Curated annotation (Swiss-Prot), chain B:
Domain notes: The E1-DIII domain binds the host receptor VLDLR.
Shown residues in whole-protein numbering: 1108 to 1156 of 1253
Origin species: Semliki forest virus
Subcellular location as annotated: Virion membrane; Host cell membrane
Post-translational modification as stated in the protein's UniProt record: Stearoylated.
UniProt topology in membrane: Single-pass type I membrane protein
Role noted for this protein: Class II viral fusion protein. Fusion activity is inactive as long as E1 is bound to E2 in mature virion. After virus attachment to target cell via host VLDLR or LRP8/APOER2 and endocytosis, acidification of the endosome induces dissociation of E1/E2 heterodimer and concomitant trimerization of the E1 subunits. This E1 trimer is fusion active, and promotes release of viral nucleocapsid in cytoplasm after endosome and viral membrane fusion. Efficient fusion requires the presence of cholesterol and sphingolipid in the target membrane.
Name recorded for this polypeptide: Spike glycoprotein E1
Superkingdom of origin organism: Viruses
Length: 48, 49
């Protein structure tokens, strides 16, 4: 009866909350560094 | 031989790689169509064609 406001309605950064595998989804915070290795087949020759 | 007037270099992109890593386009003004020779008088660059 007195639980109060759940975290589903006050989580910062619009984080939606799912319970069963307790988790916060769509948290719009921070930056994700990305390192990518590519094969030269993907690129295109300048002469073309 | 088709005559050429107003010849101009404009290097699209140059990368001094071991292979042909530089593309230059020549803007000219000819009188007719055909083929004729090209060459780099200096030595710092070597043309593919």
């Amino acid at each position: 009866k007195e639980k109060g406001t759940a975290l589903n309605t006050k989580a910062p950064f619009g984080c939606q909350i799912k319970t069963n595998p307790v988790r916060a989804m769509n948290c719009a915070v921070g930056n994700i560094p990305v390192s990518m290795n590519l094969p030269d087949s993907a690129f295109t020759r300048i002469v073309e | 031989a088709p005559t050429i007037i107003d010849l101009t270099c404009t290097v699209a992109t140059c990368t001094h790689s071991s292979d042909f890593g530089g593309v230059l386009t020549l803007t000219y003004k000819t009188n007719k169509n055909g083929d004729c020779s090209v060459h780099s008088h200096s030595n710092v660059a070597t043309l593919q064609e």
